[PDB]
Design a protein around this ligand. Structure first.
Ligand SMILES: [Mg+2]
Ligand SMILES: [Mg+2]
Ligand SMILES: [Mg+2]
Ligand SMILES: [Mg+2]
Ligand SMILES: [Mg+2]
Ligand SMILES: [Mg+2]
Ligand SMILES: [Mg+2]
Ligand SMILES: [Mg+2]
Ligand SMILES: [Mg+2]
Lengths: 168, 169, 169, 169, 171, 168
């Protein structure tokens, strides 16, 4: 056992390792969407920059968790990062619709992980997930909700280009 | 009778407390409108910022009447603030139409208050109403009128998003 | 149909938020009242006037923050009338700060009741939100008041109330 | 009971008073280590500066708890601060081995104190420990484990001198 | 067929997508090495900073080929990103040995991809790999070569600490 | 042993260690008086700040004697830091009355140590405590003297509050 390890269940160590995969998976999906909007047949430069930053924030959510593993004295176990479920993401609206599902999936995965923290009475692991993840997820989902509502209000023609140029 | 009271009738004093309530009611209604546009299924952040400023300005309107009351020797009496008329405020144009009837409602209240002050030969209350409320209210009604005219020019859909970003931010 | 953002947010919790925003605004309304009582010519404590105005506004932002929370999680903001304050005449500075200790303890307990509901329905984020923005700010507000109450007891009734107002408010 | 006391069990107060002593014992222990490295036969100036700072950072932890005791309306009870368990601390590696055993004892005291807090539905007190202590202890234990790993790597003689100059100042 | 596409063979398009995967594999491997050094039993914060950096440069190598794939009107195609060969990377010298082998592997695929571009008379694709990839990889291999020679010269204990603080925690 | 040791008596080492405990004792006592003024039913924030400043200055008095012990080549020996004599320190005037007596006890202790150093012809040790301790103690006792006088002058109620703002 690590010299720093105290109050850190091997089941919670496994839990964290499953999260860093989900986040890296999320990161990799935003990256696909990012470079899909750089396509000459799509040409939406604001979505390219927005989803590239969304991808970089998840490599960070993963790093922070990788950081948390070493802090608590766990051992980081990587698995393959699965390819995104799509190659063509359709409209700007379709892309945010995929974003909302991805974020809900990740939120739940953290809510279950937090569940597993409370269960084995890991007050610090809980704080860590409350403080860096749970409110940042709620913020992220509202933002995506707002984007969906505004992409529906704008049409699919002129409004898409304007929303791309102004709100991303 | 307050040591400061001079040429300040008790129906006028009653009249100021009725106005104070109308300002808090308007504030509350604009508070409602401001947070309806923060909803994920509405999401007009311009309208959010705008109606929040309008609510803070009606509280300042109430506060100046609260202050005025104390200046004249009167005594501030607070009633309940009635909840806004609706939960769901509809489109941007629907929200600004409510705002117009509201401001005409409080404008009419102020003009009646002026009339009362004037029948009781209270010059300084007339000046106070003239100076801080009546021109404020005409400007505020002309502003709302323009927003309505513009919200009808721009359509629903894209029109609502452009006007939100360009004219409320 | 639920809001497209709504996840892990029980309707008891939603209904909970809506109840706390009213209490927040009830408390804002009461502090406003204490505010302008100190602005009266026959009370004339301009420190206390400033202190309570600032207090009224902070609670409007506490409700304003809970309206943001409501919309973030997919809940729907529902306003009731804001009850009028319990008193017109708030007495001495010490009396006013005693009403503030009663009021902040009701509001703290209302939040601690709301957290427990949060915890009941395994709503981790709502618990963090009430812990982060409300529970520590309440404990700081109540201690400040106790200190004020103590210090208002230590100084006299007369000269002492003037100095405390000038100096600590 | 203090005029500010609300949802603060007298076992949570007793618990808070046990932790101020543990922080002061750790503070005192780091103070001995500090001045052991200032001895002409140890002469390690980085460790001296480091462990003085570690001692100063406790006492602040003791103070933040004495501070919270008063916030909640509890009553600070000061027991003897027990002498360090040694005069002679040995190597720089030997000192960080003691720090690791000390910080875990401290951590386990804080986790125990949190569970007692959770047991008596003291949401704010849990939030206090979570915010100010639980994360701090973890960062602190990781830092001490890194130090231990690093002083085994360079190992005795020049490696001790360099680790003192480069990684402690 | 893409409105911009001109003088871009479907096997070349196929080759670019194979490099983006190798570059994302390298980024992931350097990502794993990075956090190994942040373990409390490895505690080498210089190597952690340094491999953290080398990993982000590989996601940038991938992004430039993604960016290029789009410019030529080819379509980006994402395979799974294979988990790294190990969790126990060993010594600072061991990690730099795994890096000289990972970097000679990427360079050879890059040299084959250029060969293919030349084969298909794609001057621009060739120039593009010459400009952003070929001398960067040579520069990257020379730098790792020097690290290995230096990790060899310094000790296993104290030498590993100094070299971390001096040549990697700075850089 | 000690390669730096010269003209330093084993009773002088012992006296220094005895003085370090007295200074840490005073620090603890000022500490208690600190947070006693931080109570919601006492609430004198001036006194709180003043006594926190005095607790730190004594730990400093302790640290400088620890520093002196090592300079002369003696060995620091720590004992338990005795807990304060009271929990409830009463009035602002009560707390300064306690300060004076603590300061005089600590001063007489220094004057005994100086005497002991003089008896052993430790010229540097006498100057050390003359330079950093004996005059500082006289300045501290007289400051407390002024405080006691002024607290009697201001009296019990308002004057407590006014002296706490204006003069601490
Ligand atoms: Mg994420
Ligand atoms: Mg108005
Ligand atoms: Mg005029
Ligand atoms: Mg509040
Ligand atoms: Mg501590
Ligand atoms: Mg918590
Ligand atoms: Mg590369
Ligand atoms: Mg002293
Ligand atoms: Mg002399």
């Amino acid at each position: 056992p690590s010299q720093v390890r105290q109050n850190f269940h091997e089941l919670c160590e496994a839990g964290v390792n499953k999260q860093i995969n989900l986040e890296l998976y999320a990161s990799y999906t935003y990256h696909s969407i990012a470079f899909y909007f750089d396509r000459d047949d799509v040409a939406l430069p604001g979505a390219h920059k927005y989803f590239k930053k969304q991808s970089e924030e998840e490599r960070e959510h993963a790093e922070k968790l990788m950081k948390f593993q070493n802090q608590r004295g766990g051992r980081v176990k990587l698995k393959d990062i699965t390819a995104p479920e799509k190659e063509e993401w359709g409209s700007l609206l379709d892309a945010f619709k995929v974003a909302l599902e991805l974020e809900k999936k990740v939120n739940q995965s953290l809510l279950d992980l937090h569940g597993l923290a409370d269960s084995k009475k890991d007050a610090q692991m809980c704080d860590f997930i409350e403080t860096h993840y749970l409110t940042e997820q709620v913020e992220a989902i509202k933002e995506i909700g707002d984007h969906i509502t505004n992409l529906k209000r704008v049409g699919t023609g002129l409004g898409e280009f304007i929303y791309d140029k102004e709100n991303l």
